[PDB]
Write a protein that binds this DNA or RNA. Structure first.
Lengths: 153, 148
DNA sequence: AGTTACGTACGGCACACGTAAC
DNA sequence: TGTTACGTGTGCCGTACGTAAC
């Protein structure tokens, strides 16, 4: 609907995990008007705002984390242009006294190599953890499905 | 109703241009909410735009008739400005200034501080010209009050 | 070898609070 | 004497970026 000026989608970390990522992990057909679905392994952050929904300053997008190596137990963070690089320690998301999620901060580098070129594109990847750790998940795509907030400094 | 996460989170400029400016230009104009902020305790302020942060209007009145210094004293305590103000620019044109004040309970020379923090946004960019010479002698501002 | 991730700095931002002004 | 603002200090956040590890 038309939002009065200033009314925007700025959810708290727990609102993202509880009302957005958690339902999608269970139902792959969960749909949200505020947040679309892209594969950051293919799409590039410069072209990202074109393929965005209800977003001007920040863009929210669901994504499927792909394992880099067959036995790597790591995540493919490589794109055609460059590579998303994890920076700093993760941030715990708690619902009441129960840990329900985790936030990782990633900065894009155009190098696609150890000679990465730092960019101003920063992505806040939110992932299901704690009360919803893959160990106690009913064979749903938990580790795979992750919400991502992309913005430019 | 609003889907979860959708809230009133306006930019610095959005506050001055879409809310403060019309109220200054056209007195009393929008569901934004107004409060006297005169002798009102901040914990009793919600008694709401948002339970996270409360946004309310305010009428700054001069403490001293000749002082021109604005009154920030309540029965419960005083609001103490911290650091320096922040510029609000709609392009290359300065439109507003944001002052951060931290509530200090006690109302004494050395009152005990509290976690109440208020971001006061004012129309300082066009204040000097007094485009509209309101004889009401009322300075209208908008404040983001939260206890975080 | 290439790619990712860890983890401790480091710079900016949001105040904390002494010391000056009205 | 009281009350308010000013202005650096600073502690904490948001990354930067080797160095290690997968």
């Amino acid at each position: 609907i038309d939002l009065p000026p200033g009314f925007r989608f700025h959810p708290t970390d727990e609102e993202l995990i509880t009302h957005y990522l958690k339902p999608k992990v269970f139902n792959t057909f969960f749909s949200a008007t505020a947040i679309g679905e892209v594969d950051l392994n293919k799409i590039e952050p410069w072209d990202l705002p074109w393929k965005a929904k209800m977003g001007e300053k920040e863009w929210y997008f669901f994504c499927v984390r792909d394992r880099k190596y067959p036995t790597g137990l790591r995540t493919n963070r490589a794109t055609e242009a460059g590579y998303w690089k994890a920076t700093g320690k993760d941030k715990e998301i708690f619902k009441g006294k129960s840990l329900v999620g985790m936030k990782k901060t990633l900065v894009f580098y155009k190098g696609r190599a150890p000679k990465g070129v730092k960019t101003n594109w920063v992505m806040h990847e939110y992932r299901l953890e704690g009360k919803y750790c893959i160990e106690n998940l009913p064979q749903t795509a938990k580790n795979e499905w992750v919400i991502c907030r992309v913005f430019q400094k």
